[PDB]
Design an enzyme around this catalytic site. Structure first.
Site, PDB file in Angstrom:
ATOM      1  N   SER A   1       0.769  -1.238   0.000  1.00 17.85           N
ATOM      2  CA  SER A   1       0.000   0.000   0.000  1.00 17.85           C
ATOM      3  C   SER A   1       0.802   1.291   0.000  1.00 17.85           C
ATOM      4  CB  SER A   1      -0.928   0.006   1.196  1.00 17.85           C
ATOM      5  OG  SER A   1      -1.756  -1.136   1.141  1.00 17.85           O
TER       6      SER A   1
ATOM      7  N   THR B   1       4.963   0.005   6.871  1.00 17.27           N
ATOM      8  CA  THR B   1       5.379  -1.348   6.548  1.00 17.27           C
ATOM      9  C   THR B   1       5.166  -1.610   5.075  1.00 17.27           C
ATOM     10  OG1 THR B   1       4.823  -2.205   8.747  1.00 17.27           O
ATOM     11  CG2 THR B   1       4.954  -3.781   6.973  1.00 17.27           C
TER      12      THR B   1
ATOM     13  N   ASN C   1     -11.558  -4.378  -1.154  1.00 18.93           N
ATOM     14  CA  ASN C   1     -10.721  -5.565  -1.209  1.00 18.93           C
ATOM     15  C   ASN C   1     -11.344  -6.652  -2.090  1.00 18.93           C
ATOM     16  OD1 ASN C   1      -8.643  -4.585   0.640  1.00 18.93           O
ATOM     17  ND2 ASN C   1     -10.107  -4.953   2.303  1.00 18.93           N
TER      18      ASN C   1
ATOM     19  N   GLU D   1       4.458 -12.412 -20.244  1.00 16.34           N
ATOM     20  CA  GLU D   1       3.624 -11.801 -21.278  1.00 16.34           C
ATOM     21  C   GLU D   1       3.317 -10.353 -20.941  1.00 16.34           C
ATOM     22  OE1 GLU D   1       0.817 -13.598 -23.561  1.00 16.34           O
ATOM     23  OE2 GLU D   1       2.485 -14.971 -24.010  1.00 16.34           O
TER      24      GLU D   1
HETATM   25  N1  LIG Z   1      -8.109  -0.954  -0.905  1.00 22.24           N
HETATM   26  C1  LIG Z   1      -7.661  -0.909   0.318  1.00 22.24           C
HETATM   27  N2  LIG Z   1      -6.901   0.107   0.725  1.00 22.24           N
HETATM   28  C2  LIG Z   1      -6.516   0.001   2.037  1.00 22.24           C
HETATM   29  C3  LIG Z   1      -6.843  -1.015   2.944  1.00 22.24           C
HETATM   30  N3  LIG Z   1      -6.279  -0.779   4.173  1.00 22.24           N
HETATM   31  C4  LIG Z   1      -5.640   0.350   4.029  1.00 22.24           C
HETATM   32  N4  LIG Z   1      -5.734   0.874   2.762  1.00 22.24           N
HETATM   33  C5  LIG Z   1      -5.132   2.125   2.272  1.00 22.24           C
HETATM   34  O1  LIG Z   1      -3.705   2.013   2.403  1.00 22.24           O
HETATM   35  C6  LIG Z   1      -3.193   3.142   3.154  1.00 22.24           C
HETATM   36  C7  LIG Z   1      -3.020   2.780   4.595  1.00 22.24           C
HETATM   37  O2  LIG Z   1      -1.775   2.207   4.949  1.00 22.24           O
HETATM   38  P1  LIG Z   1      -1.669   1.846   6.550  1.00 22.24           P
HETATM   39  O3  LIG Z   1      -2.714   0.884   6.947  1.00 22.24           O
HETATM   40  O4  LIG Z   1      -1.672   3.148   7.279  1.00 22.24           O
HETATM   41  O5  LIG Z   1      -0.268   1.253   6.684  1.00 22.24           O
HETATM   42  P2  LIG Z   1       0.421  -0.036   6.234  1.00 22.24           P
HETATM   43  O6  LIG Z   1       0.836   0.268   4.803  1.00 22.24           O
HETATM   44  O7  LIG Z   1      -0.373  -1.230   6.490  1.00 22.24           O
HETATM   45  O8  LIG Z   1       1.827  -0.079   7.095  1.00 22.24           O
HETATM   46  P3  LIG Z   1       2.163   0.791   8.467  1.00 22.24           P
HETATM   47  O9  LIG Z   1       2.170   2.290   8.187  1.00 22.24           O
HETATM   48  O10 LIG Z   1       3.558   0.515   9.041  1.00 22.24           O
HETATM   49  O11 LIG Z   1       1.053   0.389   9.417  1.00 22.24           O
HETATM   50  C8  LIG Z   1      -4.251   4.218   3.059  1.00 22.24           C
HETATM   51  O12 LIG Z   1      -4.052   4.981   1.890  1.00 22.24           O
HETATM   52  C9  LIG Z   1      -5.532   3.397   3.034  1.00 22.24           C
HETATM   53  O13 LIG Z   1      -6.557   4.135   2.361  1.00 22.24           O
HETATM   54  C10 LIG Z   1      -7.645  -2.065   2.502  1.00 22.24           C
HETATM   55  O14 LIG Z   1      -8.009  -3.034   3.164  1.00 22.24           O
HETATM   56  N5  LIG Z   1      -8.023  -1.949   1.147  1.00 22.24           N
END
Ligand SMILES: Nc1nc2c(ncn2[C@@H]2O[C@H](COP(=O)(O)OP(=O)(O)OP(=O)(O)O)[C@@H](O)[C@H]2O)c(=O)[nH]1
Ligand SMILES: [Mg+2]
Length: 412
Positions: free
Chosen positions: A113, A118, A201, A227
């Site tokens: 993400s 992380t 998700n 591909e």
């Molecule tokens: N599509 C989708 N986006 C998500 C989901 N959970 C978080 N996000 C998005 O991903 C980002 C959040 O990242 P965090 O949950 O803060 O952090 P992390 O990348 O898991 O890692 P840490 O900062 O160390 O906790 C934001 O932009 C959220 O909108 C999810 O389940 N689905």
């Protein structure tokens, strides 16, 4: 033949649990069947724990579930350097232990993400350590880059201008799915102001199923992972195409389901259906991989696409005569028993590189500056084994990504 997957960051893990769900769901392998083929990384235990407590609990090996009880930290630095470091070895070990057990693999579908701690940092070095340990494979990283206006973390850009520059010189093809631009789809193409993360998700959990799952699955026009990168990246920059799905109709409201190819394909290029706030505001496509699945007649396609190739208002790059990789699978999609996804008998998960992201990157880069311009939360990284270098020198990095995505297009 195979393709491992490393779901990094809480999000990449939530999305992971999702994409991982859709899987068994369309392969007849209930809670307790075979054995996955991926891993889970996070520096916040409570989240990977959700995969250890909730559904799909015993479908994993406590070995492909890596955690660092320590601290997550919504900051690149800490996750990449300082903390994230400690775990990496161990992490790798699995993607070297799971990479061995198999038979002639093809690569690792990475799930992160962009704007997290992380997710941005860590991976940065995970993909980093991969490009060297298996340069001879595919590195398609499936990202969820920063909502255009609805970001979460206060720093987000710091974390995303940093995951881009460090991964850029390491990925093969980076798929992108915009969290916000997916909501629109949940509001406009499905109707629901109650979209739980658990939905977005289910969605990517769908578009992704169209990538690996079904594709690595026999069909009338198979498309290997390689591909992609081949038919999808014109240039070494770990180029980032966009994911799009066609029959995103609601399984309750409207019902015209029976929407022959000729329709579902046109529904991919309308900007209001692409899991990315990169509306083709000008971005000329330069290569699209139309992955179809279900009952589809090759002529139907080799016609529905022809009609498109001549709509012109869909302007494709110059240096590109034909940029349409038609991927046909057999088995139709497979919608959650009772979520909110229609459930058609054919779909189009078209992904592509569009000079459009010239925007999305721009708008995300600018963000960065504003804060860096004042150092904002800089002391949070410096004190975590980083320097004025890594920032300023990763800014310059993307700069040539704003010029790159500009030069490879807009010009003839
Ligand atoms: N599509 C989708 N986006 C998500 C989901 N959970 C978080 N996000 C998005 O991903 C980002 C959040 O990242 P965090 O949950 O803060 O952090 P992390 O990348 O898991 O890692 P840490 O900062 O160390 O906790 C934001 O932009 C959220 O909108 C999810 O389940 N689905
Ligand atoms: Mg987290």
């Amino acid at each position: 033949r195979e393709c491992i997957s490393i779901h990094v960051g809480q999000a990449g893990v939530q999305i992971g649990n999702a994409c991982w769900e859709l899987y068994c769901l369309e392969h007849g392998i209930q809670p307790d069947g075979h054995v996955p083929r991926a891993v889970f990384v996070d520096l916040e235990p409570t989240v990977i724990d959700e995969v250890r407590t909730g559904t799909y609990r015993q479908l994993f090996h406590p070995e492909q579930l890596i955690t660092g009880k320590e601290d997550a930290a919504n900051n690149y630095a800490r996750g990449h350097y300082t903390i994230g470091k400690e775990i990496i070895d161990l992490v790798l070990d699995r993607i070297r232990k799971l990479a061995d057990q198999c038979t002639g693999l093809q690569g690792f579908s990475v799930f992160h993400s962009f704007g997290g701690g992380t997710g941005s940092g860590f991976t940065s070095l995970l993909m980093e350590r991969l490009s060297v340990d298996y340069g001879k494979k595919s590195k398609l990283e499936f990202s969820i880059y920063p909502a255009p206006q609805v970001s979460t973390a206060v720093v987000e850009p710091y974390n995303s201008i940093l995951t881009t520059h460090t991964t850029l010189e390491h990925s093969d093809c980076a798929f992108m799915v915009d969290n916000e631009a997916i909501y629109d789809i949940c509001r406009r193409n499905l109707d629901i102001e109650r979209p739980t993360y658990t939905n977005l998700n289910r969605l990517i959990g769908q578009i992704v199923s169209s990538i690996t799952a079904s594709l690595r699955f026999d069909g009338a026009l198979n498309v290997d992972l390689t591909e992609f990168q081949t038919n999808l990246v014109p240039y070494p920059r770990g180029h980032f195409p966009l994911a799009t799905y066609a029959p995103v109709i609601s399984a309750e409201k409207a019902y015209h389901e029976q929407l022959s190819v000729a329709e579902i394909t046109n529904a991919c290029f309308e900007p209001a259906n692409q899991m990315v706030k990169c509306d083709p505001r000008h971005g000329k496509y330069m290569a699209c991989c139309l992955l179809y699945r279900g009952d589809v007649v090759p002529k139907d396609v080799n016609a529905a696409i022809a009609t498109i190739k001549t709509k012109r208002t869909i302007q494709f790059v110059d240096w590109c005569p034909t940029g349409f990789k038609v991927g046909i699978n057999y088995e139709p999609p497979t919608v959650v028993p009772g979520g909110d996804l229609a459930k058609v008998q054919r779909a189009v998960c078209m992904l592509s590189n569009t000079t459009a992201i010239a925007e999305a990157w721009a708008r995300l880069d600018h963000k960065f500056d504003l804060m860096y311009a004042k150092r904002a939360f800089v002391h949070w990284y410096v004190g975590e084994g980083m320097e004025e270098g890594e920032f300023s020198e990763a800014r310059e990095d993307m700069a040539a990504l704003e010029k790159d995505y500009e030069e490879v297009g807009v010009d003839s």
